[PDB]
Design a protein around this ligand. Structure first.
Ligand SMILES: [Ca+2]
Lengths: 359, 36, 53, 53, 53
């Protein structure tokens, strides 16, 4: 023909994009080697969780005035409880191969993040900022910081721990935030000031899991990756950095990122920036949103669950259930379980004890 | 490497025991010819 | 066949080779071990790290 | 005195049959707890057929 | 051997899950259906066109 590769100059090779737009393009079917890339954000839900309400949206991305009560117990206001943010991104379905008992799942390999609005913090001129000294300027936003985000294919698992169990958090009302005694069903004990394996709960909703109560449970967050930071001081300065060159890899030691179960990408984040020192002396926290640039790809996996046994569970007559005696858990009425496979040379002791300290 | 069959006595072949414990044990993956 | 390792037995008898500690509970009703995983061999990648049985 | 012994092993809940010595008896009603009687299964007062099969 | 083939379960499942359709009765005692014919292959022309098989 007329390519003329020798005469035609050399131009580097880069991956081409098939489409660019909003979520609507996510419904485009692709090949196996395709790589999508999602850019999204998450506004901070920090007690005043919506600008739409007309009465008091003047404090969006803020909290009401924090101050110690002065008499036991503490009855904190919902708008003084910063909570984690969260969102789910529904991803399209993929191919499957029943004969080979394999299928495709979305894998998150790398994430690029950044805190939006950092520059907005140099506003020392707010009509109610407490002056640092007479005839001077206000006290810049500073103090406590709590930075955290998480990327995973299932909701982030959480662990509960508080600074005082005497604290009477707002009730379990639907609009109210989730607290320790919400999931337990009983007034929380002083055990909860330390770690309590019973105080666990997945991060279901938004703006309902307060920060000062919940922390990421490291034991079961295994199909997700989270990062965190903190600084605690009265007027401690706030140091933040940002760029678009920093990319974070999510792969594990085996070489896989979080797998999106239910074709859903789960993102969680929370960034407390600092206080706002009012002229009246009162104080209130503030937060900023985050940018998320997740790089997704397609991976083949083996279906670990037998289909027929799994679907039969939905039928009543095939999966019967009863309210029997406790045979599983803390009150299990089982004394021993033995598994036999293959044959070996006869051992002497039939009641083999494996632990050394026991006998 | 193998031990001398004449120098070493033989024993019976009892079914091999993989594990003994509470309820948390049933999660163990076993072969197609296992017994519980 | 002798089921118990000879050396590990006598190791129990000595306080030096079997040191003990009166620490927080890691067995019994109030144990403080949240999960234990045991890996051996290799298989094809499963589609769920939170395997249920 | 009186003895009654039974055990059942199966992959399904045991299937039962109702038979009472006297249908005149009024067993306690099922109120989110309490025994379940033929009255509870049928929704009617026990008929003298129930003394038979 | 799976007694119930999966395909039949699939349709039998989503149909109940899918939103029901309360149309005019087309099955049962008051079905609004009059004739239902079924053909297969070709035969020599029979005499009676009102034949019933
Ligand atoms: Ca774990």
């Amino acid at each position: 023909c007329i390519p003329k590769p020798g005469c035609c100059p050399n131009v580097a090779s880069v991956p081409k994009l098939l489409v660019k737009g909003g979520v609507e393009v996510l419904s485009v079917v692709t090949g196996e080697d395709s790589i999508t890339q999602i850019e999204l954000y998450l506004n901070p839900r920090m007690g005043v969780n919506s600008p739409d309400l007309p009465t008091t949206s003047n404090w969006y991305t803020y909290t009401y005035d924090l101050q110690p009560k002065g008499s036991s117990p503490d009855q904190p206001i919902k708008e003084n409880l910063p909570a984690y943010s969260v969102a789910r991104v529904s991803l399209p379905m993929l191919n499957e191969d029943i004969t080979c008992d394999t299928l495709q799942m979305w894998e998150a390999i790398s994430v690029k993040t950044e805190v939006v609005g950092i520059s907005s913090l140099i506003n020392v001129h707010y009509w109610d900022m407490k002056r640092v000294h007479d005839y001077g300027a206000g006290i810049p936003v500073s103090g406590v910081n709590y930075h955290m985000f998480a990327i995973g294919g299932e909701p982030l698992d959480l662990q509960g721990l508080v600074l005082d169990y005497q604290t009477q958090y707002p009730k379990t009302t639907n609009g109210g935030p989730i607290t320790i005694e919400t999931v337990l069903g009983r007034k929380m004990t002083p055990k909860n000031q330390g770690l309590d394996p019973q105080a666990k709960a997945k991060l279901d909703k938004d703006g309902n899991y307060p920060i000062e109560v919940w922390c990421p449970d490291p034991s079961k967050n295994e199909n997700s990756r989270y990062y965190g930071s903190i600084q605690t001081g009265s007027q401690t300065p706030t140091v933040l950095q940002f760029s678009n060159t920093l990319t974070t890899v999510l792969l594990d030691e085996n070489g896989v990122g979080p797998l999106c179960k239910g074709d859903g990408l789960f993102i969680s984040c929370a960034d407390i920036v600092g206080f706002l020192f009012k002229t009246s002396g009162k104080m209130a926290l503030h937060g900023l949103p985050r940018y998320f640039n997740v790089t997704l790809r397609k991976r083949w996996v083996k279906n670990p669950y037998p289909v027929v046994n799994l679907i039969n569970s939905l039928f009543s007559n095939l999966m019967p259930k009863v309210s029997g005696q406790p045979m599983e858990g803390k009150d299990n009425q089982v004394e021993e379980v033995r598994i036999y496979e293959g044959s070996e040379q006869l051992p002497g002791d039939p009641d083999i004890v494996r632990f050394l300290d026991k006998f």
